[PDB]
Design an enzyme around this catalytic site. Structure first.
Site, PDB file in Angstrom:
ATOM      1  CG  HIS A 195     -10.949 -67.799 -28.562  1.00 52.25           C
ATOM      2  ND1 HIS A 195     -11.527 -67.684 -29.810  1.00 52.25           N
ATOM      3  CD2 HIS A 195      -9.767 -67.143 -28.631  1.00 52.25           C
ATOM      4  CE1 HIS A 195     -10.731 -66.982 -30.595  1.00 52.25           C
ATOM      5  NE2 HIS A 195      -9.653 -66.647 -29.907  1.00 52.25           N
ATOM      6  CB  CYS A 213      -6.296 -66.037 -29.122  1.00 49.54           C
ATOM      7  SG  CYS A 213      -6.496 -64.738 -27.876  1.00 49.54           S
TER       8      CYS A 213
HETATM    9  C1  LIG Z   1      -5.877 -63.203 -28.586  1.00 49.86           C
HETATM   10  O1  LIG Z   1      -5.623 -63.030 -29.740  1.00 49.86           O
HETATM   11  C2  LIG Z   1      -6.059 -62.048 -27.568  1.00 49.86           C
HETATM   12  C3  LIG Z   1      -5.099 -60.875 -27.683  1.00 49.86           C
HETATM   13  N1  LIG Z   1      -5.057 -60.200 -28.963  1.00 49.86           N
HETATM   14  C4  LIG Z   1      -3.997 -59.672 -29.123  1.00 49.86           C
HETATM   15  C5  LIG Z   1      -3.723 -58.734 -30.298  1.00 49.86           C
HETATM   16  O2  LIG Z   1      -4.684 -58.277 -30.981  1.00 49.86           O
HETATM   17  O3  LIG Z   1      -2.540 -58.438 -30.594  1.00 49.86           O
HETATM   18  C6  LIG Z   1      -2.941 -60.052 -28.172  1.00 49.86           C
HETATM   19  S1  LIG Z   1      -2.524 -58.647 -27.060  1.00 49.86           S
HETATM   20  C7  LIG Z   1      -1.137 -57.738 -27.847  1.00 49.86           C
HETATM   21  C8  LIG Z   1      -0.015 -57.440 -26.868  1.00 49.86           C
HETATM   22  N2  LIG Z   1       0.618 -56.210 -27.352  1.00 49.86           N
HETATM   23  C9  LIG Z   1      -0.177 -55.750 -28.509  1.00 49.86           C
HETATM   24  C10 LIG Z   1      -0.249 -54.241 -28.573  1.00 49.86           C
HETATM   25  O4  LIG Z   1      -0.316 -53.607 -27.565  1.00 49.86           O
HETATM   26  N3  LIG Z   1      -0.217 -53.654 -29.905  1.00 49.86           N
HETATM   27  C11 LIG Z   1      -0.267 -52.235 -30.229  1.00 49.86           C
HETATM   28  C12 LIG Z   1      -0.352 -51.856 -31.561  1.00 49.86           C
HETATM   29  C13 LIG Z   1      -0.399 -50.510 -31.896  1.00 49.86           C
HETATM   30  C14 LIG Z   1      -0.365 -49.557 -30.895  1.00 49.86           C
HETATM   31  C15 LIG Z   1      -0.281 -49.935 -29.567  1.00 49.86           C
HETATM   32  C16 LIG Z   1      -0.231 -48.883 -28.464  1.00 49.86           C
HETATM   33  O5  LIG Z   1      -0.286 -47.659 -28.761  1.00 49.86           O
HETATM   34  O6  LIG Z   1      -0.124 -49.237 -27.261  1.00 49.86           O
HETATM   35  C17 LIG Z   1      -0.231 -51.280 -29.231  1.00 49.86           C
HETATM   36  C18 LIG Z   1      -1.567 -56.392 -28.407  1.00 49.86           C
HETATM   37  C19 LIG Z   1      -3.599 -61.188 -27.409  1.00 49.86           C
HETATM   38  C20 LIG Z   1      -3.100 -62.519 -27.898  1.00 49.86           C
HETATM   39  C21 LIG Z   1      -7.532 -61.568 -27.586  1.00 49.86           C
HETATM   40  C22 LIG Z   1      -7.727 -60.534 -26.482  1.00 49.86           C
HETATM   41  O7  LIG Z   1      -7.864 -61.054 -28.840  1.00 49.86           O
END
Ligand SMILES: *C(=O)[C@@H]([C@@H]1N=C(C(=O)O)[C@@H](S[C@@H]2CN[C@H](C(=O)Nc3cccc(C(=O)O)c3)C2)[C@@H]1C)[C@@H](C)O
Length: 264
Positions: A195, A213
């Site tokens: 992106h 990303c």
């Molecule tokens: C690109 O960057 C894209 C997203 N952004 C992401 C990110 O901000 O990390 C990742 S998804 C990623 C996969 N697992 C983690 C997560 O669940 N972390 C987390 C942290 C604290 C608590 C918890 C919970 O309680 O479940 C979870 C997020 C992906 C590349 C776009 C969408 O920004």
């Protein structure tokens, strides 16, 4: 073929890619049912995939309701594919019968493979083997790295909001974010996108700054949105991340062929 009456609920198949679409060389056939399938073999037997030129392929179940079919290697550009899901009246186990048949046609476009190499911080787009774009990129930081592997291009968005609260991190917290993003091409169900990232243009080609990303310039992201289609390939190599899961949804090619064909 006639339908059989049954006290158990019917199931309807849904086929991807879309009927009449042109897709890239990484696009699997997907047959998703609105029920879990008790007799997977009966479902596979009812699905006839015909290709020209003819190529061998195999079924692999992504979950209890959705089966994928693909060849061992990326499709040959120009291949025409016919998918006949002949499930009408077929007993798919435990009294569950197919509600209808579905059929689709799709064709394979040019071979489009974009390689993001963490050693260089460059995303290079090759069309039928020829480099057409060299895009500086900024991938995930060491603590939130981009996974290596083969990603199938999915949906695309001219504009979308990326928001950490959707996975449980409040926007207001130190590591939260709510970001307006242009020209977003999705490449995993886990949420990885190519992106536009105007805020990291100076880091692109040099330093990883993202949450995972693939940040590229506004111009390069729009080019990618305009010229890369569903089923095209992004391959990430040499990051400090792991490997994209084969059952991500768009990670099919990370399953080795012997494991894919062995099926489940
Ligand atoms: C690109 O960057 C894209 C997203 N952004 C992401 C990110 O901000 O990390 C990742 S998804 C990623 C996969 N697992 C983690 C997560 O669940 N972390 C987390 C942290 C604290 C608590 C918890 C919970 O309680 O479940 C979870 C997020 C992906 C590349 C776009 C969408 O920004």
């Amino acid at each position: 073929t006639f339908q059989t009456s049954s006290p158990a609920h019917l199931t309807m198949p849904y086929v991807m890619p879309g009927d009449g679409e042109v897709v890239g060389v990484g696009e699997p056939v997907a047959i998703r049912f609105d029920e879990n399938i008790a007799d997977r073999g009966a479902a596979e037997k009812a699905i006839k995939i015909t290709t020209n030129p003819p190529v061998e392929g195999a079924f692999y179940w992504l979950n209890n309701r959705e089966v994928r079919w693909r060849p061992e290697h990326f499709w040959k550009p120009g291949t025409a594919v016919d998918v006949a899901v002949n499930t009408y009246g077929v007993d798919l186990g435990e009294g569950m019968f197919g509600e209808d048949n579905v059929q689709t046609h799709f064709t394979i476009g040019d071979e489009v493979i974009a390689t993001a190499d963490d050693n260089t911080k460059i995303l290079t787009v090759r069309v039928n083997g020829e480099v057409v774009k060299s895009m500086p990129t900024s991938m995930g930081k060491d603590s939130t790295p981009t996974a290596n592997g083969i990603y199938i291009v999915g949906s695309r968005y001219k504009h979308i909001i990326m928001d950490s609260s959707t996975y449980g991190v409040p926007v207001n917290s130190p590591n939260g974010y709510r970001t307006d993003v242009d020209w977003a091409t999705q490449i995993s169900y886990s949420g990885v996108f190519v992106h536009s990232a105007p805020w990291s243009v100076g880091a692109q080609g040099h330093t990883n700054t993202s949450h995972g990303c693939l940040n590229v310039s506004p111009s390069n992201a729009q080019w990618f949105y305009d010229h890369v289609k569903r089923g095209d390939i992004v391959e990430v190599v040499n990051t400090v991340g792991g490997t994209l899961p084969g059952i991500d949804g768009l990670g099919d090619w990370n399953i080795p062929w012997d494991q894919w064909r062995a099926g489940n």
